[PDB]
Design a protein around this ligand. Structure first.
Ligand SMILES: CC(C)CN(C[C@@H](O)[C@H](Cc1ccccc1)NC(=O)O[C@H]1CO[C@H]2OCC[C@H]21)S(=O)(=O)c1ccc(NC(=O)CCl)cc1
Ligand SMILES: [Cl-]
Ligand SMILES: [Cl-]
Ligand SMILES: [Cl-]
Ligand code: NA
Lengths: 99, 99
């Protein structure tokens, strides 16, 4: 699809057997999801943006389906105000910014 | 251009006759720039990022060039970690997300 930017570019994702709404975010290096359980090992990480840092759990090799497109990569879980699909997964679905 | 997302989508902007680096950020409603001098009056705005809410100065109808494309619109000035070009100006330069 071609997604204009008049409104937030929100899509439905499937992660950990759950459907969520998430923002396609070219300004995020990695994908950050609100609190949920994921399988496997994790390690703590701090990520920073406007307003400072939050502590997240880093899960590697997690499958997401993003607007129908499967990808695998790292997912950070923690108290983000919005679910964010970052570049680590946007690349895998072939997303580009065009102008 | 067609910008892939393997690296951060950084571009050069020109604002107040000065070149700066900024990040094309589909996850930002608003364009937010680091402390600088802009003309005219400003209005207060609270924005919420990943780590919490910050105060910024809102300047309207500011001339800004983004990757060679001319825009005129709202610029927020405050303690952002990086200069971000949000959807208010991405729409002005005709940017879309494509996959
Ligand atoms: C600020 C940029 C550099 C980074 N963010 C992504 C942005 O797209 C956030 C994304 C965002 C969106 C909503 C709420 C919170 C964050 N947008 C944001 O701060 O926008 C502000 C300006 O316009 C307003 O509209 C939205 C909030 C505000 S981030 O969310 O803070 C972030 C994401 C991942 C990492 N780390 C790694 O990935 C490693 C580090 C930071
Ligand atoms: Cl990854
Ligand atoms: Cl590619
Ligand atoms: Cl504007
Ligand atoms: Na894992």
């Amino acid at each position: 699809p071609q997604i204009t930017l008049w409104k937030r570019p929100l899509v439905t994702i499937k992660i950990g057997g759950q459907l969520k709404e998430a923002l396609l975010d070219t300004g995020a290096d990695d994908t950050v999801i609100e609190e949920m359980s994921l399988p496997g090992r994790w390690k703590p990480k701090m990520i920073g943006g406007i307003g400072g840092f939050i502590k997240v759990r880093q899960y590697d090799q997690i499958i997401i389906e993003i607007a129908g497109h499967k990808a695998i990569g790292t997912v950070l879980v923690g108290p983000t105000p919005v679910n964010i699909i970052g570049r680590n997964l946007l690349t895998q679905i072939g997303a580009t910014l065009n102008f």
